[PDB]
Design a protein around this ligand. Structure first.
Ligand code: CHL
Ligand code: CLA
Ligand code: CLA
Ligand code: CLA
Ligand code: CLA
Ligand code: CLA
Ligand code: CLA
Ligand code: CLA
Ligand SMILES: CC1=C(/C=C/C(C)=C/C=C/C(C)=C/C=C/C=C(C)/C=C/C=C(C)/C=C/C2=C(C)CCCC2(C)C)C(C)(C)CCC1
Ligand SMILES: CC1=C(/C=C/C(C)=C/C=C/C(C)=C/C=C/C=C(C)/C=C/C=C(C)/C=C/C2=C(C)CCCC2(C)C)C(C)(C)CCC1
Ligand SMILES: CC1=C(C/C=C(\C)CCC[C@H](C)CCC[C@H](C)CCCC(C)C)C(=O)c2ccccc2C1=O
Lengths: 201, 734, 91, 182, 37, 50, 80
C-alpha cells in the first residue's frame, strides 16, 4: 500500500489482496480476475527466467568466455540443427506438467510431480520477496541488452567505464541520449496529471 | 432488443434494422436533439468540440512540417527554386513494379517521392526558414501545442471548471478580446516576426533563437520610434538589383510603402507586409475598445440595435428585438460566420492569384492552379452552408412574437417578390448567355466567323483604365498624367504600381475582351441561380401553399406522400440539396475559365484565348480535348511515366461520379423488394442458413440516399477535376 | 519639432476637451437602464467575471475615474504621434 | 490600505486573507477555493523570486565570472545534458511531496511531510512580511530581467551608474542610445 | 536528435494500413451490436 | 479473449516483421530501389525544371 | 410508432377509415358536426405511415395528419 507515487489512488480492482500490489495499472489490462489469475504467473515466470539469466550473463562476462550477443554464433558444440530438436521434446513434456499443475492447483507451483519444495524452506509471505527480486531482475536484463547495444562492451566493462568514473559518460552523453531526457521529463510530470484527473471528481 | 449504440437518442437505438447504424452516424453532431439536452450542456459540448477541432488543425500542420523536413529536399530547394521541384513526401507501396518506382523517383530524391503542389515551400522560404532543423523544431512545437489544446478540451468538461450558461451569450466582452487581442496582438506579433527574422533572413543572416537578443533590426533602433522620426525607418530600401537570399543590393529599411512587385522574384516586398500588419494591428487594437465590460466607457449592442429604426416607418420596428435572437440562437450566428468566412475565402483566392505574396511563387505554375482552385471550391461549400443554416434558423429558432415588425419579419412578408425577381434575372441571363454562345457556334460551324456577336466589355475596361492600365486610351484618374490622384500618389506609392500594372506578363489585371464578357455573364447566372434556390429554400421553410405547416416537421423530412398531386423533395433540406449541384457547376465555370486563361498566358498565345473563347466548340476542342493528351497517356501498352497516378485518379473520379447517378435516378422501393428476395434466398439456403443478421437488412431511407448520391457526385467531380488540372499543368510546365 | 511639446500639448488639449465640455454628453450614455441593467443575473463565478465588481472612487468634483483619464490621454497620444509622423516624412 | 485613495473593498477582503490591499481591479479572486489556490501560488512565486533575487545579487557580490544570464553555458563537469533530468527528478519528489500534503491536510506550505516550522516564529506579522517581500521580489526580478535586456549590465553596475549621474543614465538614455550599448 | 530510422516506412505503413483498421473495425463492430442490459 | 489475443499476437508479429524481413524483393521498393536515375531531369515537357 | 392526430375540422365522412390499409382509424360518436361522427386513431402502433388517410380527406388543409417518428418492426412493414 505504499503506492507508486507518494500520494496516490488505488485502481478499483488493485486493492491490497495481491502480493506486490503497489497499485500500478494505468492502462487497465488486468480488469478481469481471470487474467489476473494468469498475468500473475506470467509475471512470476517471465521474471523467474530472467533471474536465472542474470547469473549466467554476469559470470560469462566476469570469467572470460566470449560475449553473450555472440555466444552461439561461433560454437564448438554439437550439431546446431538437431540439439534444438532436443530442446523441443524435453521442454514440451515439461510444459505439459507446468500447465497441468497450474490448472489443477491454485496459481502457485510448477514442477512435474507437486508444488516443488524438497526443502522445508519459505512458503510464506516472502513470495513477495522473490517476485520483488524478479521485477528487479527483468529491468536488469534490459540494461544488458542495451549494453550489447550502444556501447558494445559487456556489463562489467561498462561498469568500469562509468562506475569508477564521474557522470561525464552516462546515458545523456551517449548515442541514445536526447530521447531519454524527454522521456524522463515526460514520465516525471505524469503523476502530476493523474492527480489532476482525480482532484476534479 | 434495445441495443447500446447509440446512447444519445433512445428512439433511434430501438429498431431492429440497419437504419440505426447509419442514423447513429448521422445524428451525432446534432447536439440540439439528443436525449436530455438542456441549454448549458449544449454550450459546453460545443466548447469542448471546438477544442477538438483546434487540436486536429495544429496536429495536421505539424505533420506537414515533419514530412517536408524529413523526406523532402527543402535544404536543396532554397539554393535554386526556378529549378529542382518541391517534394511532398516519399512513397512505400508494396504494390509497385519496377518501372513504377523507376518513374516516380524524381526531384533529385532517391526513391518514390511525389511533387508538392501545395505552396508550403514558398511560404516557409519567404517567412524565414532555411534548413531542415528549423522545420523539425516547428513540427515539435506545433505537436506540443496541439496536445495542450486537447488537454484543455478535456479540462473544461470536468465539473468544477464547466462555464455556466451566462458566461456564454456575453457578446460585449467577447468582441473586445477577439478584436483587440486575437486580431490586433497577433498581427502586431507577426509584424515582430517579419521585422526581426524574415527581413534579415532575406538580407542574408541567421537570426535564430540564438542571438536574436543581440542583433539590431535597424541600425538606429528605437530612437526614432520614441522621438517621432518614423520616416527614418524607410530610408534606402532594397535595391531593384536585389538577389533574395543574399546581400546584394541590400537596403536597410524596415517599414516602407512601395507597391509593385519584387523585380527578381515576382512577389510583394517583405517590408510592405511588415508595414501592413503593423498598420492593421494598430487599427484592430484601437477598434477593440468599443464595447462595455466590467468598467465604464463601453457600448451596449442592444442600445445600438434599438436606436436604428428609421423615422417614417419605412422599416416597421427597424432592428427592435434582434438582439434577443442573435444572442439566443446558434444557427443565426453560424450562418453569419459561414457567410463572412466564405466571402473572405473567395477574396483570398482572388488576391493570391493576382498579387502573389511569396518568393518565387508564380514561377511554379501548378502551385498557382491548385491554390486558386482549392480556395474557390472551399468558398463554395462554405457559402452553401451559410444559407443552409439560415433555413435551420427559420425552422428551429425563429419566434414571431419576439420579432413582430423588425426587418426579419418584413423579409418574410414580401418573399414572393424576392423569389420572383431572382427567377427573372436567372431566366434573363440564361436565355441571352446560352443564345449568344449558340449563335457564335453556328457562325463558326459554317464558313463565316465574322458574322457573330462579339460585345466588347467596355465597363471593366473603363475600370482597368481607372486603375492605371494605360492601354485602352481612356486617360483618366490614374492613367492621366495631370490628375489629382495620380499626382498626389506619385511621389511614394504609385511608380511600383504602374510598373506592375503595365506589365503584360504577370497576372495583375489581365487584358480582357469579348470571351470574358460572355463568361462573366455565365458566372453571374450561376450566382443568381444558386441564390435563388437557397433563398427560396430558406424563406419557404416556415410553410408554403402546397403545405402550410412545414414547420411541424423539422428541417430534413422526406416528403408528404402522393396526395395533393404528390410532393417529392418539399423540405428545405431538399432545396439546399438541389443548390449543391449549382455550386459545383458555377465553381466549375470560374475554374475552367481561370485555368484556360492562365494556360494561354503561360504558354504564350493569348490570341488563342481571345479567338476561341467565344464559342463552346472552342472550349471543348481547345481546352478539354487538347490539354488531356499527356494525361491519358499516363500509362499505355508502351509504358508509363510520372503522371500515371493522375491518369488513374482521372478514371477513379468518373467511376464515383457515375455511381452517384444511381442513388439519384433510381429511388427506393425497387431496392426494398430486391433486398427482400435476397433475404428469402439467404434464409432458405442450406449450409448458409447458419449465419444470420443481428439487425434486419433494409434499403436506404429516402432522405439518406439523396445525401449519399450527392456525396458521390461531389467527390467524383472534385477528384476528376483535380486530376486533370494537376496532370495537365504539371505535364506542360512542371 | 520637440516631441515633448507635441505630445504633452496634445494630451493636455485632449484631457482638457474631455474634462470640460464632453463630460455630460459622455454621462448621458451611462443610462442604459432603459434597455440593459441586468447584464447577467448570476450567482457565482462565471457570472461575476461578467458583472461589475469594483467601483473606482473619485473625490474629483466632476468624477473622472482613472478610466476616463486613460481614454482621453490615449486619444491624445494617438493624435500627437500622428502629428509627429506626418511631420516625419521630410515635411 | 487599499491601492486607490478611496475604494470599497470587494468580496475578497473580508478583513484578512494573508495580507490584503483590496487590489482586484479585474475581479479574479472570487471563486471559493480558487482564491486559496491563488494565495498559495502567490506565496510560492514569491518564494522562488526571493531565492532568485538573492541568487543574482549573490552571484554578483561574490565575484563570479559571467553575468547571471550567460551563466547557463560556461562549462561544468557533468556538464549540461544530464543536468535536466536530475533537476526534474529532485524537484519532482519535493514538489509532489508539497502538493500531496497541501491537497489533503496542510492548506499552508511545507517542504517534507510537515507543517514546516523547526526553529521559527509563526504570527501574522511574519505572514504579511513574507507576502510583501514576495511581491517586492517578483517585481524586483522582472526588473532585473528587463533592465539586463535593455542595458546589458549587471544590476549593481546599473545602480552605481545611476548614482554617479541621476539626471542622465535614465531609461530614456538606454532606450534612445541602444547601439551604444550593443 | 529526432530522426526516424531508415526502416520506418516499412514498419509504420502496413501497421496503419492493416492492423489499426483491423482493431478499429473489430472493436467498433463489437461495440455496435452490444445489447443494453 | 484467448484466440482473439492470439490473432493479435500473431498479426503483429507477422506484419511488423514483414516490414524489415519482407525484403524478398517486394518487387520494387525494399532496398532494390531505382538503379537508374529515373526522371530526375525529365520533369517538364516545355520547361525542364528537374 | 408514428403520430396520427385528428383535428376538429373533421366532418366525419368516413373516407379515411375506408382508405386505411391497417385498421388504425375508427369512427366515434361526436356532437360537433352534421354527421355526428368523428374519426379517431386508437391503434397508432399498427400504423406504417403510408398516408392514404391524408389523401382521402376532403376538407382542405387536412383534418388528419400523420407525423413520422421512430420506426419499429411493425411500423416498417417488415414481413420477414
Ligand atoms: C527556469 C528558469 C530559467 C531562466 C529564467 C533561464 C534564463 C536563460 N537561460 Mg537558462 N534559464 C532557466 C533555466 C535553465 N537554463 C539552463 C541552461 C541554459 C543554457 C545552456 C543556456 C541558457 C540560456 C538562457 C537564456 C535564454 C534567453 C533566450 O535566448 O531565450 C530564447 C530561447 C529559448 C526560449 C530557447 C536566459 C537568460 C542561454 C544563454 O545563456 O544565452 C545568453 C544558454 O545558452 N540556459 C538549464 C539547465 C539545462 C535550466 C534549468 O533550470
Ligand atoms: C512482462 C512481465 C510482467 C507481467 C506479465 C506482469 C504482470 C502484472 N503486474 Mg507487473 N511488473 C513487471 C513485469 C510484469 N508484470 C516489471 C518488469 C515491473 C517493474 C518495472 C513490474 C511492476 C509492477 C507493479 C509496480 C505492479 C505490477 C502489477 C502487475 C499485475 C496487474 C497489472 C496488470 O494488469 O498487468 C498486466 C501487464 C501485462 C500483461 C504486461 C503486458 C506487456 C506490455 C503489453 C508490453 C510492455 C513493454 C514495455 C512497455 C516496453 C519495455 C519497457 C522498458 C523500456 C522499461 C499483473 C499480474 C500490479 C499489481 O497488481 O501488483 C503486483 C502493480 O501494482 N507490476
Ligand atoms: C539458465 C539460463 C542459461 C542459459 C540459457 C545458458 C546458455 C549457455 N551457457 Mg550458461 N550459465 C548459466 C545460465 C545459462 N546459460 C548460469 C546460471 C551460469 C553460472 C553457473 C552459467 C555459466 C556458464 C559458463 C561458465 C559457460 C556457459 C556457456 C553457455 C553456452 C553453451 C551452452 C552449453 O552447451 O554449455 C553446457 C551447458 C549445459 C550442459 C547446461 C545444462 C544444464 C550457452 C549459450 C558456455 C559458453 O558460452 O561457452 C562458449 C560456458 O563456457 N554458461
Ligand atoms: C486575448 C484573449 C483571447 C484569445 C487569444 C482568444 C482566442 C480564441 N478564442 Mg476566445 N475568448 C476570450 C478571449 C480570447 N480568445 C474571452 C475573454 C472570452 C469570453 C468572452 C472568450 C470566449 C470564447 C469562446 C466561447 C470561444 C472562444 C474561441 C476562441 C478560439 C477561436 C478559434 C480560432 O482558432 O480562431 C483563430 C482565428 C484567427 C487566427 C483569426 C482569423 C483572422 C482571419 C479571418 C484569417 C486570415 C488572416 C491571415 C490571412 C491568415 C494567415 C494564413 C497563414 C496560414 C498564411 C481562439 C483560440 C472559440 C474556440 O475555439 O474555443 C476553443 C470558442 O468557442 N473564445
Ligand atoms: C462551421 C462548420 C459547420 C458546423 C459547425 C456545422 C454544424 C452542423 N450542421 Mg452543417 N454545414 C456546413 C458547416 C457546418 N455545419 C457546411 C459547410 C454545409 C454545406 C455542405 C453544411 C450543411 C448542413 C446540412 C445540410 C445540415 C447541417 C446540419 C448540421 C448540424 C448537425 C450536423 C450533423 O449531424 O452532421 C453529421 C455529419 C456527418 C454524418 C458526416 C457526413 C460525411 C459527409 C457526407 C462527408 C463525406 C465525404 C467523404 C469523407 C469523402 C471521402 C473521400 C474518399 C475517397 C476517401 C450541426 C449543427 C444538419 C442539421 O442541422 O440537421 C437538421 C443538416 O441538415 N449542415
Ligand atoms: C535558486 C536560485 C539559484 C539558482 C537557480 C542558481 C544557479 C546557479 N548558481 Mg547560484 N546562488 C544562489 C542561488 C541560485 N543559484 C544564491 C542564493 C547564492 C548566494 C549564496 C548563489 C551563489 C552562487 C555562486 C557564488 C556561484 C553560483 C553559481 C551558479 C551556477 C552553477 C551552479 C553552481 O555550481 O552553484 C554553486 C553552488 C551553489 C550556489 C549552492 C548556476 C547557474 C556558480 C557559477 O558558475 O556562477 C555563475 C558560482 O560560482 N551561485
Ligand atoms: C524574508 C522572507 C520570508 C519571510 C518573512 C517568511 C516567513 C515565514 N515563512 Mg517562509 N520562505 C521564504 C521566505 C520568507 N518566509 C523563502 C525564500 C522560502 C523558500 C525556501 C520559504 C519557504 C517556506 C516554507 C516552505 C514554509 C515557510 C513558512 C513560513 C512561516 C513560518 C516560518 C517562520 O518562522 O518564518 C521565519 C522567517 C524569518 C525569520 C525570516 C528569514 C530570515 C533568513 C534566515 C535570512 C536569510 C538570508 C539569505 C540566505 C541571504 C513564516 C510566516 C512556513 C509556513 O508558512 O507554514 C505555515 C512553511 O511551511 N516558508
Ligand atoms: C496528422 C497529420 C499527419 C498525416 C496525415 C500523416 C500521414 C502519413 N504519415 Mg505521418 N506523422 C505525423 C503526422 C501525420 N502523418 C506526425 C506528427 C509524426 C510524428 C510522430 C508522424 C510520423 C510518421 C512516421 C514515422 C511515418 C509516418 C508515415 C506516414 C504515411 C503513412 C501513413 C502512416 O503510417 O502514418 C503513421 C503516422 C503516425 C504513426 C503518426 C500519427 C500520430 C498521431 C498521434 C495520430 C493521429 C490520429 C488521427 C488524427 C486519428 C484518425 C483515425 C480515426 C479516423 C480512427 C502518411 C503519408 C510513414 C511514412 O512516412 O511512410 C512513407 C512513417 O513511417 N508518419
Ligand atoms: C439565409 C439567412 C441568413 C444568411 C444570409 C446570408 C448567407 C447572406 C449573405 C450575404 C452576403 C454574402 C453579402 C455580401 C455582401 C457584400 C457586400 C455588401 C460588398 C460590399 C462591397 C463594397 C461596399 C466595396 C466597396 C468598394 C469598392 C466598390 C471598391 C473600392 C473599395 C471600396 C470599399 C470603396 C442569416 C444567417 C442572416 C439568417 C437569416 C437567414
Ligand atoms: C493632479 C491634478 C491635476 C493634474 C492632473 C493630470 C495632469 C493628470 C494627467 C494624467 C495623464 C497625463 C494621463 C496620461 C495617460 C496616458 C495614456 C493613457 C497613454 C496611452 C498611450 C497610448 C494609447 C499609445 C499608444 C500607441 C503607441 C504605444 C505608439 C503609437 C501608436 C499607439 C497610439 C497605438 C491638475 C493640476 C490639473 C489639478 C487637479 C489635480
Ligand atoms: C443501391 C441502392 C440501395 C441499396 C443500398 C444498400 C443495400 C446499401 C449498400 C451499401 C453496402 C452494404 C456497403 C457499401 C460499402 C461502403 C464502403 C460502406 C461505407 C460505410 C461507411 C461507414 C464508411 C438503396 O437502398 C437505395 C435507396 C434509395 C435510393 C437509391 C438506392 C440505391 O441506389
Amino acid at each position: 500500500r505504499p503506492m507508486w507515487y507518494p500520494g496516490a489512488t488505488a485502481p478499483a480492482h488493485l486493492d491490497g489482496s495481491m502480493l506486490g500490489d503497489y497499485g500500478f495499472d494505468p492502462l487497465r489490462l488486468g480488469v478481469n480476475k481471470d487474467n489476473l489469475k494468469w498475468f500473475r504467473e506470467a509475471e512470476l515466470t517471465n521474471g523467474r527466467w530472467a533471474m536465472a539469466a542474470v547469473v549466467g550473463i554476469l559470470f560469462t562476462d566476469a570469467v572470460g568466455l566470449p560475449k553473450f550477443w555472440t555466444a552461439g554464433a561461433e560454437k564448438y558444440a554439437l550439431d546446431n540443427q538437431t540439439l534444438a530438436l532436443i530442446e523441443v521434446a524435453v521442454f514440451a513434456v515439461l510444459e505439459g506438467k507446468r500447465y497441468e499443475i497450474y490448472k489443477k492447483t491454485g496459481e502457485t507451483g510448477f514442477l512435474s510431480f507437486a508444488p516443488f519444495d524438497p526443502m522445508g524452506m519459505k512458503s510464506e509471505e516472502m513470495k513477495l520477496k522473490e517476485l520483488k527480486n524478479g521485477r528487479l531482475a527483468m529491468l536488469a536484463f534490459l540494461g544488458f541488452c542495451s549494453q550489447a547495444a550502444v556501447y558494445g562492451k559487456g556489463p562489467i566493462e561498462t561498469l568500469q567505464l562509468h562506475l569508477a568514473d564521474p557522470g561525464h559518460n552516462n546515458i545523456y552523453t551517449s548515442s541514445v541520449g536526447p530521447e531519454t531526457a524527454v522521456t524522463v521529463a515526460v514520465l516525471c510530470v505524469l503523476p502530476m496529471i493523474i492527480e489532476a484527473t482525480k482532484t476534479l471528481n | 432488443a434495445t441495443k447500446l449504440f447509440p446512447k444519445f437518442s433512445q428512439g433511434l437505438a430501438q429498431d431492429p434494422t440497419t437504419r440505426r447504424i447509419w442514423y447513429g452516424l448521422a445524428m451525432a453532431h446534432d447536439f440540439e436533439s439528443h436525449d436530455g439536452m438542456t441549454e448549458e450542456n449544449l454550450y459546453q459540448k460545443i466548447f469542448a468540440s471546438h477544442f477538438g477541432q483546434l487540436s486536429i488543425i495544429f496536429l495536421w500542420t505539424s505533420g506537414n512540417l515533419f514530412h517536408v523536413a524529413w523526406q523532402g529536399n527543402f535544404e536543396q530547394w532554397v539554393t535554386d527554386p526556378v529549378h529542382i521541384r518541391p517534394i511532398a513526401h516519399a512513397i512505400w507501396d508494396p504494390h509497385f513494379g519496377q518501372p513504377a518506382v523507376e518513374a516516380f523517383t524524381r526531384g533529385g530524391a532517391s526513391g518514390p517521392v511525389n511533387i508538392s503542389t501545395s505552396g508550403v515551400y514558398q511560404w516557409w522560404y519567404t517567412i524565414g526558414m532555411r534548413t531542415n532543423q528549423d522545420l523539425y523544431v516547428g513540427s515539435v512545437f506545433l505537436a506540443l501545442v496541439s496536445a495542450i489544446f486537447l488537454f484543455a478540451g478535456w479540462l473544461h468538461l470536468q465539473p468544477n471548471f464547466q462555464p455556466s450558461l451566462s458566461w456564454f451569450k456575453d457578446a460585449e466582452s467577447r468582441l473586445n478580446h477577439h478584436l483587440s487581442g486575437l486580431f490586433g496582438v497577433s498581427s502586431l506579433a507577426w509584424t515582430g516576426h517579419l521585422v526581426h527574422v524574415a527581413i534579415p533572413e532575406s538580407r542574408g543572416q541567421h537570426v535564430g533563437w540564438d542571438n536574436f537578443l543581440s542583433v539590431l533590426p535597424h541600425p538606429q533602433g528605437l530612437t526614432p520610434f520614441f522621438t517621432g522620426n518614423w520616416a527614418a525607418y524607410a530610408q534606402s530600401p532594397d535595391t531593384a538589383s536585389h538577389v533574395f537570399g543574399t546581400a546584394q543590393g541590400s537596403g536597410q529599411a524596415i517599414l516602407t510603402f512601395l507597391g509593385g512587385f519584387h523585380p527578381q522574384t515576382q512577389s510583394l516586398w517583405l517590408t510592405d507586409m511588415a508595414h501592413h500588419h503593423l498598420a492593421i494591428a494598430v487599427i484592430f487594437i484601437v477598434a477593440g475598445h468599443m464595447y462595455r465590460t466590467n468598467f465604464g466607457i463601453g457600448h451596449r449592442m442592444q442600445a445600438i440595435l434599438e436606436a436604428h429604426t428609421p423615422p417614417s416607418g419605412s422599416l416597421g420596428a427597424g432592428h427592435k428585438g434582434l438582439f434577443d435572437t442573435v444572442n439566443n440562437s446558434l444557427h443565426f450566428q453560424l450562418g453569419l460566420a459561414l457567410a463572412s468566412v466564405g466571402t473572405i475565402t473567395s477574396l483570398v483566392a482572388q488576391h493570391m492569384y493576382s498579387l502573389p505574396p511569396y518568393a518565387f511563387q508564380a514561377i511554379d505554375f501548378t502551385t498557382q492552379a491548385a491554390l486558386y482552385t482549392h480556395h474557390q471550391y472551399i468558398a463554395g461549400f462554405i457559402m452553401c452552408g451559410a444559407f443552409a443554416h439560415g433555413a435551420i434558423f427559420f425552422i428551429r429558432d425563429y419566434d414571431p412574437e419576439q420579432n413582430k415588425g423588425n426587418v426579419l419579419a418584413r423579409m418574410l412578408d414580401h418573399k414572393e417578390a424576392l423569389i420572383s425577381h431572382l427567377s427573372w434575372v436567372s431566366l434573363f441571363l440564361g436565355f441571352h448567355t446560352l443564345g449568344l454562345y449558340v449563335h457564335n457556334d453556328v457562325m463558326q460551324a459554317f464558313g463565316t466567323p465574322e458574322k457573330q456577336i462579339l460585345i466588347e466589355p467596355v465597363f471593366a475596361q473603363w475600370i482597368q483604365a481607372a486603375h492605371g492600365k494605360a492601354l485602352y486610351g481612356f486617360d483618366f484618374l490614374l492613367s492621366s498624367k495631370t490628375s489629382a490622384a495620380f499626382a498626389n500618389g506619385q511621389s511614394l506609392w504609385l511608380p511600383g504600381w504602374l510598373d506592375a500594372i503595365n506589365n503584360n506578363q504577370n497576372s495583375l489585371f489581365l487584358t480582357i475582351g469579348p470571351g470574358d464578357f460572355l463568361v462573366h455573364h455565365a458566372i453571374a447566372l450561376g450566382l443568381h441561380t444558386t441564390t435563388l434556390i437557397l433563398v427560396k429554400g430558406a424563406l419557404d421553410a416556415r410553410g408554403s401553399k402546397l403545405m402550410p405547416d412545414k414547420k411541424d416537421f423539422g428541417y430534413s423530412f422526406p416528403c408528404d406522400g402522393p396526395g395533393r398531386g404528390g410532393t417529392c423533395d418539399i423540405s428545405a433540406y431538399d432545396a439546399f440539396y438541389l443548390a449543391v449541384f449549382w455550386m459545383l457547376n458555377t465553381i466549375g465555370w470560374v475554374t475552367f475559365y481561370w485555368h484556360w486563361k492562365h494556360l494561354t498566358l503561360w504558354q504564350g498565345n493569348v490570341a488563342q484565348f481571345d479567338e476561341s473563347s467565344t464559342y463552346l466548340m472552342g472550349w471543348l476542342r481547345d481546352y478539354l480535348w487538347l490539354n488531356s493528351s499527356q494525361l491519358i497517356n499516363g500509362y499505355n501498352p508502351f509504358g508509363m511515366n510520372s503522371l500515371s497516378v493522375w491518369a488513374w485518379t482521372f478514371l477513379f473520379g468518373h467511376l464515383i461520379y457515375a455511381t452517384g447517378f444511381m442513388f439519384l435516378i433510381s429511388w427506393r422501393g425497387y431496392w426494398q423488394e430486391l433486398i427482400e428476395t435476397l433475404v428469402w434466398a439467404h434464409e432458405k439456403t442450406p449450409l448458409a442458413n447458419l449465419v444470420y443478421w443481428k439487425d434486419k437488412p433494409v434499403a436506404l431511407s429516402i432522405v439518406q440516399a439523396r445525401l449519399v448520391g450527392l456525396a458521390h457526385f461531389s467527390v467524383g467531380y472534385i477528384f476528376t477535376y483535380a486530376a486533370f488540372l494537376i496532370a495537365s499543368t504539371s505535364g506542360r510546365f512542371g | 519639432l520637440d516631441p515633448q511639446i507635441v505630445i504633452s500639448g496634445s494630451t493636455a488639449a485632449f484631457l482638457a476637451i474631455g474634462r470640460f465640455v464632453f463630460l455630460g454628453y459622455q454621462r448621458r450614455e451611462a443610462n442604459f437602464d432603459s434597455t440593459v441593467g441586468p447584464k447577467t443575473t448570476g450567482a457565482t463565478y462565471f457570472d461575476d467575471l461578467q458583472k461589475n465588481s469594483t467601483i473606482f472612487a473619485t473625490n474629483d468634483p466632476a468624477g473622472f475615474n482613472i478610466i476616463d483619464v486613460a481614454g482621453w490621454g490615449a486619444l491624445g497620444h494617438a493624435v500627437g504621434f500622428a502629428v509627429l509622423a506626418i511631420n516625419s516624412l521630410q515635411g | 490600505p487599499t491601492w486607490l485613495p478611496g475604494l470599497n473593498p470587494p468580496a475578497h477582503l473580508k478583513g484578512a486573507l494573508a495580507g490584503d490591499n483590496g487590489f482586484d481591479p479585474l475581479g479574479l479572486g472570487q471563486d471559493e477555493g480558487r482564491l486559496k489556490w491563488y494565495a498559495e501560488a502567490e506565496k510560492t512565486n514569491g518564494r522562488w523570486a526571493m531565492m532568485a533575487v538573492a541568487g543574482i545579487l549573490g552571484q554578483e557580490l561574490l565575484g563570479v565570472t559571467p553575468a547571471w544570464w550567460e551563466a547557463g553555458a560556461k562549462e561544468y563537469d557533468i556538464p549540461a545534458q544530464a543536468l535536466t533530468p536530475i533537476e526534474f527528478i529532485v524537484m519532482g519528489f519535493l514538489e509532489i511531496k508539497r502538493y500531496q500534503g497541501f491537497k489533503q491536510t496542510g492548506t499552508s506550505g511545507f517542504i517534507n511531510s510537515f507543517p514546516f516550522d523547526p526553529a521559527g516564529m509563526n504570527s501574522p506579522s511574519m505572514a504579511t512580511k513574507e507576502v510583501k517581500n514576495g511581491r517586492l521580489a517578483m517585481v524586483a526580478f522582472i526588473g532585473f530581467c528587463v533592465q539586463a535586456l535593455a542595458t546589458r549590465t549587471q544590476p549593481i553596475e546599473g545602480l552605481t551608474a545611476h548614482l554617479a549621474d541621476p539626471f542622465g543614465k535614465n531609461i530614456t538614455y538606454y532606450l534612445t542610445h541602444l547601439p551604444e550599448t550593443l | 536528435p529526432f530522426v526516424p530510422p531508415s526502416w520506418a516506412p516499412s514498419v509504420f505503413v502496413p501497421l496503419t494500413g492493416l492492423v489499426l483498421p483491423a482493431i478499429a473495425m473489430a472493436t467498433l463492430f463489437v461495440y455496435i451490436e452490444k445489447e443494453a442490459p | 479473449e484467448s484466440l482473439r489475443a492470439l490473432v493479435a499476437l500473431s498479426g503483429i508479429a507477422a506484419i511488423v516483421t514483414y516490414g524489415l524481413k519482407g525484403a524478398k524483393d517486394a518487387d520494387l521498393p525494399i532496398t532494390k530501389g531505382p538503379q537508374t536515375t529515373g526522371e530526375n531531369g525529365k520533369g517538364g515537357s516545355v520547361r525542364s525544371r528537374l | 410508432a408514428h403520430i396520427v392526430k385528428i383535428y376538429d375540422t373533421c366532418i366525419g365522412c368516413t373516407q379515411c377509415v375506408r382508405a386505411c390499409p391497417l385498421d388504425v382509424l375508427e369512427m366515434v360518436p361526436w356532437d360537433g358536426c352534421k354527421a355526428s361522427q368523428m374519426a379517431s386513431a386508437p391503434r397508432t402502433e399498427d400504423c406504417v405511415g403510408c398516408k392514404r388517410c391524408e389523401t382521402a380527406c376532403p376538407t382542405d388543409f387536412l383534418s388528419v395528419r400523420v407525423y413520422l417518428g421512430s420506426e419499429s418492426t411493425r411500423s416498417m412493414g417488415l414481413s420477414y
